[PDB]
Enzyme design. Structure first.
Site, mmCIF file in Angstrom:
data_model
loop_
_atom_site.group_PDB
_atom_site.id
_atom_site.type_symbol
_atom_site.label_atom_id
_atom_site.label_comp_id
_atom_site.label_asym_id
_atom_site.label_seq_id
_atom_site.Cartn_x
_atom_site.Cartn_y
_atom_site.Cartn_z
ATOM 1 N N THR A 159 45.015 42.098 19.575
ATOM 2 C CA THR A 159 46.087 41.111 19.754
ATOM 3 C C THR A 159 46.782 41.088 21.105
ATOM 4 N N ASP A 261 45.334 36.478 10.562
ATOM 5 C CA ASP A 261 44.966 37.878 10.804
ATOM 6 C C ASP A 261 45.489 38.776 9.676
ATOM 7 N N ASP A 308 43.798 34.339 19.346
ATOM 8 C CA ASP A 308 43.613 35.513 20.208
ATOM 9 C C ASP A 308 42.221 36.149 20.070
ATOM 10 N N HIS A 309 41.660 36.148 18.853
ATOM 11 C CA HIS A 309 40.410 36.878 18.521
ATOM 12 C C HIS A 309 40.044 36.466 17.088
ATOM 13 N N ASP A 685 35.670 48.689 40.270
ATOM 14 C CA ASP A 685 36.763 47.708 40.274
ATOM 15 C C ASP A 685 36.259 46.268 40.072
ATOM 16 N N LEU A 687 34.447 44.733 42.152
ATOM 17 C CA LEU A 687 34.453 44.107 43.489
ATOM 18 C C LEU A 687 33.506 44.822 44.433
HETATM 19 C C1 LIG Z 1 41.315 39.888 38.723
HETATM 20 O O1 LIG Z 1 42.378 39.258 39.434
HETATM 21 C C2 LIG Z 1 43.320 40.162 39.948
HETATM 22 C C3 LIG Z 1 44.499 39.429 40.574
HETATM 23 O O2 LIG Z 1 44.094 38.672 41.690
HETATM 24 C C4 LIG Z 1 42.652 41.091 40.962
HETATM 25 O O3 LIG Z 1 43.564 42.145 41.128
HETATM 26 C C5 LIG Z 1 44.026 42.333 42.465
HETATM 27 O O4 LIG Z 1 43.056 43.025 43.252
HETATM 28 C C6 LIG Z 1 43.427 43.494 44.558
HETATM 29 C C7 LIG Z 1 42.359 44.505 45.038
HETATM 30 O O5 LIG Z 1 42.118 45.507 44.033
HETATM 31 C C8 LIG Z 1 44.815 44.181 44.565
HETATM 32 O O6 LIG Z 1 45.281 44.270 45.900
HETATM 33 C C9 LIG Z 1 45.939 45.543 46.131
HETATM 34 O O7 LIG Z 1 47.347 45.417 45.966
HETATM 35 C C10 LIG Z 1 48.126 46.579 46.224
HETATM 36 C C11 LIG Z 1 49.602 46.269 45.927
HETATM 37 O O8 LIG Z 1 49.650 46.061 44.530
HETATM 38 C C12 LIG Z 1 50.960 45.835 43.958
HETATM 39 O O9 LIG Z 1 51.464 44.514 44.178
HETATM 40 C C13 LIG Z 1 50.870 43.439 43.430
HETATM 41 C C14 LIG Z 1 51.514 42.093 43.812
HETATM 42 O O10 LIG Z 1 52.723 41.828 43.123
HETATM 43 C C15 LIG Z 1 50.900 43.742 41.917
HETATM 44 O O11 LIG Z 1 50.288 42.716 41.165
HETATM 45 C C16 LIG Z 1 50.218 45.089 41.626
HETATM 46 O O12 LIG Z 1 50.205 45.341 40.223
HETATM 47 C C17 LIG Z 1 49.258 46.381 39.834
HETATM 48 O O13 LIG Z 1 49.835 47.674 39.693
HETATM 49 C C18 LIG Z 1 50.856 47.805 38.706
HETATM 50 C C19 LIG Z 1 51.146 49.292 38.541
HETATM 51 O O14 LIG Z 1 51.936 49.701 39.628
HETATM 52 C C20 LIG Z 1 50.491 47.213 37.333
HETATM 53 O O15 LIG Z 1 51.663 46.855 36.630
HETATM 54 C C21 LIG Z 1 49.565 45.989 37.375
HETATM 55 O O16 LIG Z 1 48.963 45.851 36.095
HETATM 56 C C22 LIG Z 1 48.529 46.075 38.518
HETATM 57 O O17 LIG Z 1 47.612 47.133 38.259
HETATM 58 C C23 LIG Z 1 46.213 46.788 38.483
HETATM 59 O O18 LIG Z 1 45.829 46.774 39.857
HETATM 60 C C24 LIG Z 1 45.971 48.028 40.540
HETATM 61 C C25 LIG Z 1 45.677 47.866 42.036
HETATM 62 O O19 LIG Z 1 46.692 47.083 42.637
HETATM 63 C C26 LIG Z 1 45.093 49.101 39.870
HETATM 64 O O20 LIG Z 1 45.376 50.362 40.431
HETATM 65 C C27 LIG Z 1 45.306 49.146 38.343
HETATM 66 O O21 LIG Z 1 44.313 49.938 37.739
HETATM 67 C C28 LIG Z 1 45.311 47.754 37.691
HETATM 68 O O22 LIG Z 1 43.984 47.261 37.605
HETATM 69 C C29 LIG Z 1 50.897 46.196 42.455
HETATM 70 O O23 LIG Z 1 52.176 46.456 41.911
HETATM 71 C C30 LIG Z 1 47.890 47.101 47.648
HETATM 72 O O24 LIG Z 1 48.528 48.352 47.768
HETATM 73 C C31 LIG Z 1 46.395 47.243 48.002
HETATM 74 O O25 LIG Z 1 46.254 47.461 49.409
HETATM 75 C C32 LIG Z 1 45.347 48.543 49.774
HETATM 76 O O26 LIG Z 1 44.041 48.088 50.103
HETATM 77 C C33 LIG Z 1 44.055 47.144 51.167
HETATM 78 C C34 LIG Z 1 42.708 46.429 51.287
HETATM 79 O O27 LIG Z 1 42.919 45.138 51.818
HETATM 80 C C35 LIG Z 1 44.458 47.812 52.488
HETATM 81 O O28 LIG Z 1 44.785 46.827 53.452
HETATM 82 C C36 LIG Z 1 45.647 48.775 52.357
HETATM 83 O O29 LIG Z 1 45.438 49.809 53.301
HETATM 84 C C37 LIG Z 1 45.898 49.382 50.955
HETATM 85 O O30 LIG Z 1 45.350 50.691 50.933
HETATM 86 C C38 LIG Z 1 46.380 51.705 50.799
HETATM 87 O O31 LIG Z 1 46.526 52.169 49.461
HETATM 88 C C39 LIG Z 1 45.359 52.796 48.934
HETATM 89 C C40 LIG Z 1 45.535 53.064 47.436
HETATM 90 O O32 LIG Z 1 46.598 53.964 47.210
HETATM 91 C C41 LIG Z 1 45.015 54.053 49.758
HETATM 92 O O33 LIG Z 1 43.816 54.645 49.307
HETATM 93 C C42 LIG Z 1 44.875 53.696 51.245
HETATM 94 O O34 LIG Z 1 44.627 54.862 52.018
HETATM 95 C C43 LIG Z 1 46.093 52.887 51.739
HETATM 96 O O35 LIG Z 1 47.250 53.696 51.830
HETATM 97 C C44 LIG Z 1 45.589 46.009 47.543
HETATM 98 O O36 LIG Z 1 45.813 44.901 48.386
HETATM 99 C C45 LIG Z 1 45.867 43.472 43.698
HETATM 100 O O37 LIG Z 1 47.029 44.262 43.497
HETATM 101 C C46 LIG Z 1 45.311 43.156 42.317
HETATM 102 N N1 LIG Z 1 46.319 42.460 41.515
HETATM 103 C C47 LIG Z 1 46.491 42.626 40.205
HETATM 104 C C48 LIG Z 1 47.562 41.806 39.521
HETATM 105 O O38 LIG Z 1 45.819 43.375 39.499
HETATM 106 C C49 LIG Z 1 41.339 41.632 40.408
HETATM 107 O O39 LIG Z 1 40.602 42.194 41.479
HETATM 108 C C50 LIG Z 1 40.455 40.559 39.768
HETATM 109 N N2 LIG Z 1 39.303 41.173 39.145
HETATM 110 C C51 LIG Z 1 38.045 40.814 39.470
HETATM 111 C C52 LIG Z 1 36.957 41.581 38.753
HETATM 112 O O40 LIG Z 1 37.794 39.892 40.255
HETATM 113 C C1 LIG Z 2 54.030 43.738 16.334
HETATM 114 C C2 LIG Z 2 54.391 42.471 17.047
HETATM 115 O O1 LIG Z 2 55.396 42.422 17.743
HETATM 116 N N1 LIG Z 2 53.560 41.317 16.906
HETATM 117 C C3 LIG Z 2 53.845 40.082 17.584
HETATM 118 C C4 LIG Z 2 52.878 39.630 18.486
HETATM 119 C C5 LIG Z 2 53.060 38.454 19.185
HETATM 120 C C6 LIG Z 2 54.228 37.714 18.967
HETATM 121 C C7 LIG Z 2 54.489 36.443 19.680
HETATM 122 O O2 LIG Z 2 55.510 35.822 19.377
HETATM 123 C C8 LIG Z 2 53.500 35.960 20.694
HETATM 124 C C9 LIG Z 2 53.982 34.750 21.405
HETATM 125 C C10 LIG Z 2 52.964 34.237 22.399
HETATM 126 C C11 LIG Z 2 52.416 32.981 22.207
HETATM 127 C C12 LIG Z 2 51.477 32.447 23.096
HETATM 128 C C13 LIG Z 2 51.076 33.192 24.202
HETATM 129 C C14 LIG Z 2 50.067 32.591 25.154
HETATM 130 F F1 LIG Z 2 50.570 31.506 25.737
HETATM 131 F F2 LIG Z 2 49.794 33.463 26.109
HETATM 132 F F3 LIG Z 2 48.961 32.175 24.519
HETATM 133 C C15 LIG Z 2 51.624 34.461 24.405
HETATM 134 C C16 LIG Z 2 52.563 35.003 23.505
HETATM 135 C C17 LIG Z 2 55.187 38.149 18.066
HETATM 136 C C18 LIG Z 2 55.018 39.330 17.376
HETATM 137 N N2 LIG Z 2 56.063 39.709 16.476
HETATM 138 CA CA LIG Z 3 34.094 48.221 44.232
HETATM 139 ZN ZN LIG Z 4 44.512 42.081 13.394
#
Ligand SMILES: *[C@@H]1O[C@H](CO)[C@@H](O[C@@H]2O[C@H](CO)[C@@H](O[C@@H]3O[C@H](CO[C@H]4O[C@H](CO)[C@@H](O)[C@H](O[C@H]5O[C@H](CO)[C@@H](O)[C@H](O)[C@@H]5O[C@H]5O[C@H](CO)[C@@H](O)[C@H](O)[C@@H]5O)[C@@H]4O)[C@@H](O)[C@H](O[C@H]4O[C@H](CO)[C@@H](O)[C@H](O)[C@@H]4O[C@H]4O[C@H](CO)[C@@H](O)[C@H](O)[C@@H]4O)[C@@H]3O)[C@H](O)[C@H]2NC(C)=O)[C@H](O)[C@H]1NC(C)=O
Ligand SMILES: CC(=O)Nc1ccc(C(=O)CCc2ccc(C(F)(F)F)cc2)cc1N
Ligand SMILES: [Ca+2]
Ligand SMILES: [Zn+2]
Ligand SMILES: [Cl-]
Ligand code: NA
Length: 803
Positions: A159, A261, A308-309, A685, A687
């Site tokens: 979910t 579900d 969702d599924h 990753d 990529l």
């Molecule tokens: C699917 O689509 C998505 C979205 O477009 C693609 O994901 C992007 O991929 C990019 C490359 O991997 C990545 O870019 C990096 O961003 C870093 C900054 O990231 C923060 O800011 C963004 C923007 O708001 C934010 O979204 C990020 O959120 C991540 O992390 C938090 C946790 O803190 C999570 O809440 C969130 O879920 C998300 O996690 C996911 O991504 C991270 C990686 O960012 C993973 O670790 C997780 O497992 C998870 O999957 C962040 O809050 C930035 O720091 C990076 O920059 C490094 O590399 C560049 C290369 O250009 C370089 O210039 C720099 O030097 C830098 O390197 C330095 O750091 C290194 C690591 O510590 C270190 O080794 C070096 O020595 C350097 O010091 C990089 O630009 C982008 O963040 C994500 N975005 C998201 C939302 O995931 C994804 O690729 C697509 N998938 C496919 C298959 O196509």
């Molecule tokens: C244990 C537990 O909390 N189960 C629940 C799980 C889900 C919800 C929601 O109300 C989901 C609402 C929602 C609708 C559409 C989207 C979209 F747009 F992404 F499709 C995203 C979220 C509520 C409960 N109570």
């Molecule tokens: Ca790779």
């Molecule tokens: Zn279920």
């Protein structure tokens, strides 16, 4: 602490969240135990139920009632949804003929058509047909709007990972919700379906639609509903919000139903008990559409009906127990059920060994109903590895089965479950779009839920945050608001080397029995090396290289390649095999033949000595010598520039694909064009790796070892036309095979390749887009097709499931 002594008077289902400890009246105050004292009284009225009756018509407004049937209810925006039907002789929406909505027909002050997302949990795709008789409102949405036969969820088919993927356009590994249960080792914190930790914002990554909207000035209804708020009240709340003044009114809304579900888990997906939940969800849709019609919004709002599924038959007796495999069961933690995730019970235990856990779980019982994987070895189409919350050891569980740690964990409370591989038919779910912006009576091919965020942004005029959808791939669902992308610019232009090196300049340790000796044929062979057959073998233009690198185009009679001077091998090799093509052998005198390529420097070539010395590593060829057009052309297939490093166990797979399956596909598809190549993804990753991310080389050399090998196999959708003379739409299937030193994944691999190889390839089916991410290449640059149609083609996944 919450000071629940404040009041919800005039605040019921308020949109802005008020900060602690002031008491809340928003639609998630229940989940926080923080509702004001009078929330139930004021905000959850139930008196007299949900429907107007004849005797209530024109009643004196009694503020206590759940909904109203007084003359003033319309201007108040709080009539029961059947008010106009019961009291004013109107028809139910479902009883009205469908009429094309060519333009939005919106009340004055509406800046854009609102979007309402009606989400249903566990709504299996086949319910649309199988339950159509008891779901008339849904059937009308489906038949009159735009619908897919099914929509593919993300893995795991649970979910929260799916709802959040719908909301963000991201894979779970990127948005962070990788299961309904999680441990994050950096936070040292656990996420569970039941409880409070899950509301902490640190779990939830990316940018969900309601945040996207809000940042761009588009107001959003509050998407989440506490479980105890009845569906009737959810619908009435939405309708009430829709009657707010223009400046206060949201443009995007979400409804959620925990059915079917909830019942599906108890009764199985087709339990006789399932009819009622389907009727009830349809009734809820009816209430919404009636309510929209009352508000004159039924030809203004875009409605998305989405699940969702799905749901599969699963019972307690179909459980595999790790205690039947592992000696050391108490040293592991398992996340169990329709998938398995294993990690060490204690980080202080230095006798924990993933390798021995994997081996003890591999092909140990003949009918084994799960398969263990290191996460990096999971099919790349799952995109399920690049997150610290995903345990290194994963169990892919067969549909219909569970995995558990020990029998005592299982004690039968249930008949349905979900979570399995997202290509399994039972896991597929539903998509219908209905409204002015969607097409009329249009069926669209199945597509992935990661694509919907982009479209929802399009429907609202928002710029999507960066996501994993391919924007424009779903333009064919839309009447207007399409997103017209341009092809990415090529970053690296190729070199086109001619003959620049003498044979003796090479010291590669290779040999070939090729000194077997004509102005008729010599000009013709020169033509081939200049590209005179390129139009036969490169059918959709050269792939564009979207990063900075140094590479050469190499032409040959039977194949064309893009040869990387950095990775010492092709990035891509392209060739066409007609239906008529003949398969031949590698001649005895040519078994160990490798030939220097006089267009490419010794310094940018592989060498044979490296392979001789690497006792684990052998080599194969990207263009297969088996499919050479002639004895003379076959020599081209042995060029050092067509060679790639392959483990012997992998060569079994590759040789069977090249010798047997390519021909079979050309026979079946009326010719095929094949693009094959290496992939390097050592940090899993999804990529393309840079040169400095490669963890393994052919011993002693700078020859990098691919983590995977891909092929893209294209033909004419109209198979009465040959692949190389196709006038219309294309048909594609692709794979990304893991380049592994054993065939432990395939339990039947000691058998002939005809019994196991294609089954492996099917498991590793891929979209062209997956290969794009993994290679930095952009395919299909020169076709006669619209770019949007090509984007759809690139997101296609050939699943091999039955209908
Ligand atoms: C699917 O689509 C998505 C979205 O477009 C693609 O994901 C992007 O991929 C990019 C490359 O991997 C990545 O870019 C990096 O961003 C870093 C900054 O990231 C923060 O800011 C963004 C923007 O708001 C934010 O979204 C990020 O959120 C991540 O992390 C938090 C946790 O803190 C999570 O809440 C969130 O879920 C998300 O996690 C996911 O991504 C991270 C990686 O960012 C993973 O670790 C997780 O497992 C998870 O999957 C962040 O809050 C930035 O720091 C990076 O920059 C490094 O590399 C560049 C290369 O250009 C370089 O210039 C720099 O030097 C830098 O390197 C330095 O750091 C290194 C690591 O510590 C270190 O080794 C070096 O020595 C350097 O010091 C990089 O630009 C982008 O963040 C994500 N975005 C998201 C939302 O995931 C994804 O690729 C697509 N998938 C496919 C298959 O196509
Ligand atoms: C244990 C537990 O909390 N189960 C629940 C799980 C889900 C919800 C929601 O109300 C989901 C609402 C929602 C609708 C559409 C989207 C979209 F747009 F992404 F499709 C995203 C979220 C509520 C409960 N109570
Ligand atoms: Ca790779
Ligand atoms: Zn279920
Ligand atoms: Cl889970
Ligand atoms: Na095997």
């Amino acid at each position: 602490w919450t000071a629940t002594s404040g009041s919800c008077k005039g605040r019921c289902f308020e949109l802005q969240e008020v900060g602690p400890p002031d008491c809340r009246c928003d639609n998630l105050c229940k989940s926080y135990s923080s509702c004001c004292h009078d929330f139930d009284e004021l905000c959850l009225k139930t008196a007299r139920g949900w429907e107007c009756t004849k005797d209530r018509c024109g009643e004196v407004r009694n503020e206590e009632n759940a909904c109203h049937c007084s003359e003033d209810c319309l201007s108040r925006g709080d009539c029961c949804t059947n008010y106009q039907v019961v009291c004013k002789g109107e028809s139910h929406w479902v009883d009205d003929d469908c009429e094309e909505i060519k333009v939005p027909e919106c009340p004055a002050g509406f800046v854009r058509p609102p979007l309402i997302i009606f989400s249903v949990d566990g709504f299996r795709a086949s319910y649309m047909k199988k339950g159509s008789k008891v779901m008339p409102n849904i059937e009308k949405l489906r038949s009159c709007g735009t619908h897919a036969p099914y929509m593919r969820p993300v893995y795991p088919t649970k979910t929260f990972p799916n709802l959040y993927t719908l909301a963000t356009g991201l894979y779970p590994e990127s948005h962070g919700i990788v299961g309904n249960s999680m441990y994050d080792p950096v936070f040292d914190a656990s996420f569970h379906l039941r409880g409070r930790e899950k509301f902490n914002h640190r779990w939830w990554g990316g940018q969900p639609l309601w945040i996207t909207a809000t940042k761009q000035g588009v107001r959003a209804g509050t998407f989440f509903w506490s479980v105890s708020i009845p569906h009737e009240r959810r619908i009435l709340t939405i309708l009430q919000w829709l009657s707010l003044p223009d400046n206060e009114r949201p443009s995007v809304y979400a409804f959620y139903s925990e059915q079917p579900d909830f019942s599906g888990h108890k009764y199985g997906p087709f339990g006789p008990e399932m009819t009622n939940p389907l009727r009830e969800i349809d009734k809820t849709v009816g209430q919404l559409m009636d309510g929209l019609k009352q508000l004159r919004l039924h030809r203004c709002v875009n409605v998305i009906f989405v699940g969702d599924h799905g749901m599969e038959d699963v019972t307690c007796d179909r459980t595999e127990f790790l205690s039947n495999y592992l000696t050391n069961v108490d040293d592991i933690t398992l996340v169990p059920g329709t998938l398995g995730r294993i990690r060490a019970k204690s980080i202080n235990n230095s006798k924990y060994d993933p390798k021995t856990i994997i081996a003890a779980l591999t092909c140990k019982k003949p009918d084994q109903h799960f398969k263990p994987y290191m996460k990096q070895h999971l099919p790349k189409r799952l995109h399920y590895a690049n997150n610290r919350r995903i345990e290194d050891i994963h169990l892919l569980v067969d549909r219909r089965w569970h995995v558990a740690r020990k029998p005592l964990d299982v004690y039968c409370f249930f008949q349905g479950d979900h979570g399995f591989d997202n290509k399994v038919n039972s896991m597929q779910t539903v998509f219908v779009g209905y409204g002015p912006t969607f097409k009329y009576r249009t069926k669209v091919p199945p597509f992935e839920n990661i694509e919907l965020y982009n479209v929802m942004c399009d429907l609202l005029g928002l710029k999507p945050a960066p996501n994993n959808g391919t924007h424009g791939s779903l333009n064919h669902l839309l009447r207007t608001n399409t997103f017209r992308p341009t092809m990415p610019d090529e970053v690296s232009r190729p070199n086109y080397p001619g003959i620049m090196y003498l044979q003796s300049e090479f010291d590669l340790g290779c040999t070939c029995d090729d000194k077997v000796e004509n102005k008729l044929e010599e000009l013709n062979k020169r033509l081939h090396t200049k590209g005179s057959t390129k139009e036969r073998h490169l059918l959709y233009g050269r792939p564009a290289v979207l990063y900075r690198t140094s590479y050469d185009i190499l032409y040959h009679t039977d194949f064309e390649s893009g040869y990387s001077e950095i990775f010492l091998m092709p990035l891509w090799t392209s060739y066409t095999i007609s239906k008529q093509a003949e398969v031949s052998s590698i001649p005895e005198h040519l078994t160990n033949c490798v030939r220097p390529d006089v267009r490419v420097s010794p310094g940018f070539s592989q060498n044979c000595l490296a392979y001789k010395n690497d006792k684990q590593m052998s080599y194969g060829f990207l263009f297969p010598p088996y499919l050479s057009s002639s004895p003379e052309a076959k020599y081209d297939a042995f060029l050092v520039t067509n060679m790639v490093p392959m483990y012997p166990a992998f060569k079994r797979v590759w040789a069977y694909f090249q010798r047997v399956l390519v021909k079979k596909y050309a026979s079946e598809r009326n010719g095929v064009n094949v693009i094959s190549g290496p992939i390097f993804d050592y940090n899993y990753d999804g990529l393309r790796d840079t040169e400095d991310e490669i963890k393994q080389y052919v011993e002693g050399s700078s020859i990098p070892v691919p983590t995977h090998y891909y092929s893209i196999i294209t033909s004419c959708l109209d198979f009465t036309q040959p692949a190389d003379k196709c006038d219309g739409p294309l048909s594609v299937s692709s794979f990304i095979l893991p380049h592994r030193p054993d065939n432990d994944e395939s339990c039947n691999s000691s058998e002939d390749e005809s019994k196991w190889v294609e089954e492996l390839m099917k498991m590793h089916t891929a979209r062209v887009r997956d290969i794009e991410h993994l290679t930095g290449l952009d395919f299909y640059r020169k076709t006669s097709r619209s770019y949007s149609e090509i984007l759809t083609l690139k997101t296609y996944l050939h699943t091999y499931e039955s209908e």
